[PDB]
Amino acid sequence: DELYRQSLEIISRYLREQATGAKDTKPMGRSGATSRKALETLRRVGDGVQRNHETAFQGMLRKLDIKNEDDVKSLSRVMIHVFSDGVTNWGRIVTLISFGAFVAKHLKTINQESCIEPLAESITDVLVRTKRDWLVKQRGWDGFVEFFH
């Protein structure tokens, strides 16, 4: 119940603060410090990988044809297909979240900023439902931060 809350918190914060250039006006909620270290890891690595995959991400966005929140409810299935099953590791996870961050930037640009919030949820939903057991075998986000030092 709570690990989903933690992950969702991190992703929503990262996506918003990537979309807007701001750094939030408060700290984090319950389990806040681990979530902060995760968010700063994201700050570094997400921008790096987004720069590396600018071409593929930008062409995919060119395809995705996103207009409103209904598009958000219809994109989760493409996200699931691309993230699917097979090789599981932290790099693919940060890549998931990083494409979420680019999508959030774009949504703010088209003034459809309100769609950033369901997006994160969808990401987070797909993130837990598909990797839950493995995440606990990584003691959650602890495996994340320690991996990326």
Ligand X SMILES: Cc1cc(OCCCc2c3n(c4c(-c5c(C)nn(C)c5C)c(Cl)ccc24)CCCN(c2cccc4c(C(=O)O)cn(C)c24)C3=O)cc(C)c1Cl
**Segment near ligand X (CB under 6 A); pick from 24-32, 35-43, 54-62, 109-117:** 54-62
85: contact with ligand X by CB under 6 A: no
CB 141 within 8 A of CB 10: yes
CB 71 within 8 A of CB 65: yes
Q: Give the integer Cα–Cα distance in Å for 58 and 95.
A: 14
Could you say which of 5, 36, 37, 92 contacts ligand X (CB under 6 A)? Answer: 92
Closest C-alpha to 100, from 40, 35, 15: 15
Q: Give the integer Cα–Cα distance in Å for 11 and 142.
A: 15
103: contact with ligand X by CB under 6 A: yes
Q: For ligand X, give the closer residue by CB, 38 or 72.
A: 72
Residues that bind ligand X (CB under 6 A): 53, 56-57, 60, 75, 78-79, 82-83, 87, 89, 91-92, 95-96, 99-100, 103, 123
